[PDB]
Design an enzyme around this catalytic site. Structure first.
Site, PDB file in Angstrom:
ATOM      1  CE1 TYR A   1      -3.086  78.222  24.978  1.00 46.13           C
ATOM      2  CE2 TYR A   1      -5.155  78.339  23.731  1.00 46.13           C
ATOM      3  CZ  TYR A   1      -3.786  78.391  23.782  1.00 46.13           C
ATOM      4  OH  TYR A   1      -3.029  78.586  22.667  1.00 46.13           O
TER       5      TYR A   1
ATOM      6  CE1 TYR B   1      -0.319  77.039  28.345  1.00 45.79           C
ATOM      7  CE2 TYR B   1       0.676  75.564  26.672  1.00 45.79           C
ATOM      8  CZ  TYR B   1      -0.075  75.767  27.823  1.00 45.79           C
ATOM      9  OH  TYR B   1      -0.650  74.714  28.495  1.00 45.79           O
TER      10      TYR B   1
ATOM     11  NE  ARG C   1       3.545  76.642  19.778  1.00 48.06           N
ATOM     12  CZ  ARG C   1       2.670  77.010  18.887  1.00 48.06           C
ATOM     13  NH1 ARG C   1       1.346  76.854  18.993  1.00 48.06           N
ATOM     14  NH2 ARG C   1       3.184  77.511  17.746  1.00 48.06           N
TER      15      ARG C   1
ATOM     16  CG  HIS D   1      -0.226  80.433  19.140  1.00 47.49           C
ATOM     17  ND1 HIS D   1       0.453  80.308  20.342  1.00 47.49           N
ATOM     18  CD2 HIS D   1      -1.258  79.534  19.195  1.00 47.49           C
ATOM     19  CE1 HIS D   1      -0.124  79.371  21.056  1.00 47.49           C
ATOM     20  NE2 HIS D   1      -1.126  78.893  20.411  1.00 47.49           N
TER      21      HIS D   1
ATOM     22  CG  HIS E   1      -4.964  77.648  18.157  1.00 45.94           C
ATOM     23  ND1 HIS E   1      -4.190  76.579  17.732  1.00 45.94           N
ATOM     24  CD2 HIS E   1      -4.481  78.031  19.369  1.00 45.94           C
ATOM     25  CE1 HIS E   1      -3.291  76.336  18.671  1.00 45.94           C
ATOM     26  NE2 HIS E   1      -3.400  77.176  19.645  1.00 45.94           N
TER      27      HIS E   1
HETATM   28  O1  INO Z   1       0.717  70.641  20.179  1.00 48.36           O
HETATM   29  C1  INO Z   1       0.863  71.102  21.299  1.00 48.36           C
HETATM   30  O2  INO Z   1       1.292  70.371  22.212  1.00 48.36           O
HETATM   31  C2  INO Z   1       0.521  72.575  21.591  1.00 48.36           C
HETATM   32  C3  INO Z   1       0.639  73.083  22.901  1.00 48.36           C
HETATM   33  C4  INO Z   1       0.236  74.386  23.137  1.00 48.36           C
HETATM   34  N1  INO Z   1      -0.261  75.146  22.152  1.00 48.36           N
HETATM   35  O3  INO Z   1      -0.620  76.399  22.466  1.00 48.36           O
HETATM   36  C5  INO Z   1      -0.416  74.703  20.924  1.00 48.36           C
HETATM   37  O4  INO Z   1      -0.925  75.445  20.052  1.00 48.36           O
HETATM   38  C6  INO Z   1      -0.063  73.389  20.573  1.00 48.36           C
HETATM   39 FE    FE Z   2      -2.100  77.119  21.402  1.00 49.70          FE
END
Ligand code: INO
Ligand code: FE
Ligand code: INO
Ligand code: INO
Ligand code: INO
Ligand code: FE
Ligand code: FE
Ligand code: FE
EC number: 1.13.11.3
Lengths: 233, 200, 233, 200, 233, 200, 200
Positions: free
Chosen positions: E105, E144, E154, E157, E159
């Site tokens: 990211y 990720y 993860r 995805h 968001h």
């Molecule tokens: O809730 C989290 O810790 C988390 C981490 C990484 N991503 O990509 C998410 O969408 C959520």
């Molecule tokens: Fe995420």
């Protein structure tokens, strides 16, 4: 005037209840013994009254107010009127009548020992909208014992009459409530031979249409004979 | 084959039909506007007539809880579908039989002639739907007039009834009620002289 | 005095609803966080009051007369009280309370907009007979909206309390009506994890017990903890 | 293994419990005979006491809709199971908390000593069942008296509670209400100082 | 200004993930312990912003051009936003954010060792059309790693944030890609109790919307709370 | 029953939510038009106020990656749904907490009174939706002002919260920042002093 | 619903029913004690009468292999269930039709009045069950007397038959046989003048 521009899908007389269904006593002497005579559709049958100009009262469709408040389960009965092709039937007359919460009707001839509700009449009428939608507000009627067999009880139900576009579509029916264990026992319900047809008569609980903390809702869609344009006649 | 959505099944109207479709009869208060048995107002063109009858079950007994709906053309043979109480004439009406004597009545005008889909004229007629307890699905019939013998003989609809004796069940007998033109049309649901009922 | 001559089958705490069932909001703050402490049965727990001498009124069990006639579906709720071994529980106290036909309770705190029925109280009590039979006559209560989720409605139900032979058997429950589509949606009903257990709470239509042309009947049997004699203690 | 018939599942008593089991509180007319909070009549043998308390939820808030049932031995340590309003003393009673302050009260006598199944005496105690909205299955507890320290220390039931600090939750604190002997027994349903509840 | 003309179907809190889902570690301390308080819908809840006059840049929905070319699988993500009644939601705001082809990211706090893509930002916005359609052009994000359990990844995805007609409909979600083997192992995904619910979060390959010799396409439809007119209030 | 299409399930906004909804905060270049924390232009009518607060987790630790969205009426008790950067006032705004000290701020005006569906006026309030990693489905709450006690005491909404102590968690405490009217509103997601969260 | 064990299904008595229930008629030797057609001993109290009748099929032909069973109260309006050949009167009897002329006879007394469950008196009547080959499940009917018109007009049972003409099928016509009081009761199973058959 009205004009002959439509044809209606022929009724399936094996889907509808038959005239003679002996378990429903009254039908014995009130059923023809000769065959119905099939006739071609003409203007006489393909036309019908339009109720767009009838003067409807403000609470014609609100049984809670049209007659205190009545005692019973406050419900909204809503649904759509479509034809066999799935086409909405706009500005059509939907009329209904039922018993009170205890199964007593506000009619001379009703002698059932359950009492009348001072704030309840039992009649409603609604013209469907552009999308074929109608709605009523009332109380859920109670089961009603009747002199058929020695221990016959009608499931709770609301009588419905729908006009549609012609005298050809005109229908009188009854709505039953989802899950009522009396349904499968009723000789009137059983006049209908296909279990599949019976299901069409069952209004489904509609939580999405309910008014939180106020009243529940039931969904009841009605299908009228399919309307097509005449061709190659 | 192709199958469409099934039509909602019919159910009898029951014995309390009146509370919903014939308030007065029910013995209940009526609303401002109601659909009843007066198709024409005195100042309506055409021959003003009174229709009356009884309905019999298969045992020869009167059906005193019957409900009827009528559809007819005006005097000029036109179907007036825009129902309105202000109209001098409405093509549609409703009537019911009395819990006493058990006779229904309707105040109308003798309908004009209309052609079938093939362009052939039909004898003047009133379309009738009969509803009652014990009737699972409403019965369809037609009322023709005994004074229209010539037209009746050529009717493409009457002519579809194979046995001539059966055609006679559809003919109302002209009479007079309080010295006013009336036609009696009795319906025999089952048995001897059983009325012809149609499917359309 | 009462004597320690019996032992009761241990309760199955996985059959009964658990204390904490989050969908039923109130249970959140009204559930213990510490484990229940298991204790051996003694006279304190194996005994209980006998209600054989309470002075019952003539219509204690007749909700149609104990408070005109109430408006609603006249029904008889009858059944038997047996223990886990199938043994009748004679001369036991069965108490019940419910809403009216519209889902309104005759209680200060009830603000539901449906009206009270002037001829209806909502309380009944009956001592079971030699065979463990009880019966009540009342009207079927209506569904009741409550402040849980935004659109939560209790299925129609009758609250029941049964004494049994000891404080060990004492139970508070609710009866539901066969077929009611609200059943599977209720967070209180859903507090019970086994679908099999839920079924025990459903009163069945009992046409055999109905009074023709008068009232319908529902059958509701109740099972209390099994009673055995002590052995090798 | 052997399986018997399943016991009927418990359901909460709900908020309207009073209309059925505590008529007065409900604000309804009562019947001739009712089971209430007066276990002993003035002329009953034993030390006459007044019991009172409050019920707290996990947030520290009063449960004003709670319903309680009590079972105790008379002064001679006997369980009087034949319930009768004529009795000088009944082993059974019922009480409820007020929608206002939210305090329940019970008029009784300090119970005598009873032996457990192994023949060991238990400290004087009152058995209590708590019912209310939010309670799926009633909670069982016991009320012991702070003035019975010696007996309390030897109780085979109290001794089953592993942590001594937890035992203290079962002890009512002696006091006086309008110069009359009373014991306060508050119930904490969840959280800090949570009351011991039993399974039997 | 806005008017209170609609009601939104109550949310199904057993369909969406619950607040406390222990395998998703961070939910432990960030979930309420008290029950939510249910309130009746009013103008406060049934209205929300309309973004029709927001000044969108020409490449707001094109991640290939809004920040050379990004490295990664070029894809179009398109679909439609409808309500529970299946009615399109026109002129509604759809926003998305995601990682690069490698799972990194473009955020301060992201220390994953996979490098940033000089030509990729990872943000897009689009106002649905008259038919409720939206579309973005981007590159497929990579899985990720995250500090949940010791070896948690993860699944790839995107968001999503969708406004809808009111604050009652506003939702935040994630899109997952058809057939990714990571989906069923993810604790965040697993926060959703019903596997049927999981399915709604999966974008399906859509060869029909693909640009031959250029980019693939994925279809993602979104369903917001059903909107109905108020009745008998 | 009637079942409609299921609503798309919610998912946590995750830790990187700023990249999409709070560009600056993410430390990324913003676009020409962004929805942010200034609902009113200095020349907007009404009593201009500054809102600020912290968000705490169940352990009392600050939640520094939370995202908030607000919806409120203008000073006339009116919802301005047509969002435009040119308006003097917008009913909608966005805010987020600092990765440092962890405090959000909003620049707006005190909302006028709006009536509920029944026609009863609600106390001035700001609707809030809270999102953040660890939060599966966003949390709804309302911000009331401590200087409107009269109105707050009669709010149909505040009055739905059973316990009075819980109503207090929704009242922002008036203060002043640089001689500017301010109200602090801390959100406790879990535990002691846990804020009231709604379902609608 | 609750389902009980199903009742054993009925079967026609068949043509040879006399072998088992009307030994003489079969032309077989009887036993010491037989249940027959003489309910009252010449010295029984009440107005001694002779009952007789024929049974017709749907074609108007006599049914000569029918078996009948009667149940009636004595002259005091009392049911005498303890059957004994020694009693002067028995409430139960059996009869059958002649393979010749085909007429049954019964020697009894005119029944006294009995009240229905509601406490309303029914007109004097004899309950009849008819069995025969071709009859799958026996037919129930009642015999009323034409000389009790007053009572018959007020019978709660007769009054349940919708049509007055049908009530008449249940009235036996008084006559005299050898200067002996007699009532003729013909049963028409099907068609024209078909007798009213009950379900209870
Ligand atoms: O809730 C989290 O810790 C988390 C981490 C990484 N991503 O990509 C998410 O969408 C959520
Ligand atoms: Fe995420
Ligand atoms: O056909 C009947 O006899 C009948 C009786 C009572 N109800 O309620 C009906 O709907 C029909
Ligand atoms: O636990 C409750 O809140 C509740 C509410 C209403 N009724 O009818 C119940 O039985 C239970
Ligand atoms: O009904 C008949 O005709 C018949 C004939 C012979 N047997 O044996 C029967 O049982 C009945
Ligand atoms: Fe009916
Ligand atoms: Fe309840
Ligand atoms: Fe045989």
């Amino acid at each position: 005037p009205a004009q002959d521009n439509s044809r209606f899908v022929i009724r399936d007389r094996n889907w509808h209840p038959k005239a003679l269904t002996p378990d429903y006593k009254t039908s014995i002497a009130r059923s023809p013994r000769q065959a119905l005579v099939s006739i071609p559709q003409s203007i006489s049958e393909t036309t019908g009254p339009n109720f767009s100009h009838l003067g409807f009262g403000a609470h014609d469709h609100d049984l809670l107010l049209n007659f205190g408040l009545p005692i019973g389960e406050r419900i909204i009965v809503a649904g759509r009127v479509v034809d066999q092709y799935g086409k909405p039937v706009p500005n059509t007359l939907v009329e209904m009548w039922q018993a009170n919460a205890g199964g007593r009707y506000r009619h001379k001839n009703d002698r059932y020992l359950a009492p009348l509700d001072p704030n309840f009449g039992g009649v409603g009428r609604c013209l469907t909208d552009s999308d074929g939608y109608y709605s009523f507000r009332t109380i859920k009627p109670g089961p009603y014992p009747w002199r058929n067999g020695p221990n016959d009880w009608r499931p709770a139900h609301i009588h419905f009459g729908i006009s549609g576009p012609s005298i050809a579509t005109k229908l009188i029916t009854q709505l039953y409530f989802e899950g009522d264990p009396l349904i499968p026992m009723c000789p009137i319900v059983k006049s209908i031979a296909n279990p599949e047809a019976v299901q069409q008569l069952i209004a489904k609980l509609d939580m999405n249409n309910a008014n939180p903390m106020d009243c529940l809702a039931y969904r009841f869609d009605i299908v009228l004979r399919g309307q097509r344009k005449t061709h190659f006649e | 084959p192709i199958e469409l959505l099934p039509e909602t099944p019919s159910q009898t109207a029951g014995p309390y039909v009146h509370i919903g479709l014939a308030l007065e009869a029910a013995g209940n208060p009526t609303r401002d506007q109601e659909i009843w048995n007066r198709l024409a107002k005195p100042d309506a063109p055409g021959e003003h007539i009174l229709l009356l009858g009884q309905v019999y079950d298969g045992n020869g007994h009167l059906v005193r809880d019957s409900f009827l709906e009528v559809w007819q053309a005006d005097a000029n043979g036109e179907y007036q579908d825009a129902y309105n109480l202000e109209n001098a004439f409405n093509s549609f009406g409703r009537t019911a039989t009395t819990f006493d004597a058990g006779e229904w009545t309707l105040h109308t005008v003798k309908p004009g002639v209309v052609n079938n889909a093939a362009g052939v004229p039909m004898a003047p007629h009133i379309n009738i739907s009969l509803f009652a307890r014990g009737i699972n699905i409403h019965l369809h019939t037609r009322l023709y007039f005994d004074d229209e013998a010539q037209a009746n003989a050529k009717c493409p609809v009457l002519n579809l009834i194979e046995q001539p004796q059966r055609r006679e069940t559809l003919i109302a007998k002209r009479c007079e009620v309080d010295g006013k033109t009336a036609y009696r049309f009795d319906i025999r649901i089952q048995g001897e002289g059983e009325t012809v009922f149609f499917d359309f």
